[PDB]
């Protein structure tokens, strides 16, 4: 996942209930790589959003076709968010990956809602 950027050392005295102790800590700097997550998460998330757009080129008169594409497009977006969210631990704050999928959720939902008002 990461790349070893570099290392850094320190030396400081931590105070505790049992006395003052000299502590030495080594800091390793690790920089994430998103290549896997793009193919794993973003690229499926990007491609599914495009499936919503082709709804527009499809004829409006094809009511089952548009809804079929719309409901299939949004529903699989839900699964992608969960499995993408599954990779993360249980932390109570929205992350950047969460932000991307949610915005992609808006597009697919809006695309379905676009046909709802279109009909």
């Amino acid at each position: 996942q990461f790349s070893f950027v570099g290392l850094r050392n320190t030396t400081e005295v931590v105070k505790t209930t049992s006395g003052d102790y000299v502590v030495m800590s080594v800091y390793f700097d690790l920089s994430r790589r998103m290549g896997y997550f793009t193919i794993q998460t973003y690229i499926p998330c990007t491609l599914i959003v495009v499936l919503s757009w082709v709804s527009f080129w499809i004829n409006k008169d094809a009511v089952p076709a548009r809804t079929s594409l719309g409901i299939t497009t949004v529903l699989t977006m839900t699964t992608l968010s969960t499995i993408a969210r599954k990779s993360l631990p249980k932390v109570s704050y929205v992350t950047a990956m969460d932000l991307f999928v949610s915005v992609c959720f808006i597009f697919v939902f809006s695309a379905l809602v676009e046909y709802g008002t279109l009909h």
Binding site: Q1, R33, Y36, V54, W57, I58
Partner: protein, 77 residues
Amino acid sequence: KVAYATAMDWFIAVCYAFVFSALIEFATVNYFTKRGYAWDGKTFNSVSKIDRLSRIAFPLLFGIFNLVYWATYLNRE
């Protein structure tokens, strides 16, 4: 996890293009589909040249991809 794409990914990726291109192909056919009704055993939509040609290009081109893909990787030292 690995920061590179394996030979498995390229076949899955190219297969993704073929299946995705199939959707775009129908969308293009849908654009020129003038009439909503179908043939009855008045004018009826003739079978599009896109389909009549995609019936040949897509399998023929996909087959060529398999030859290149499998020959490349199977014979590697």
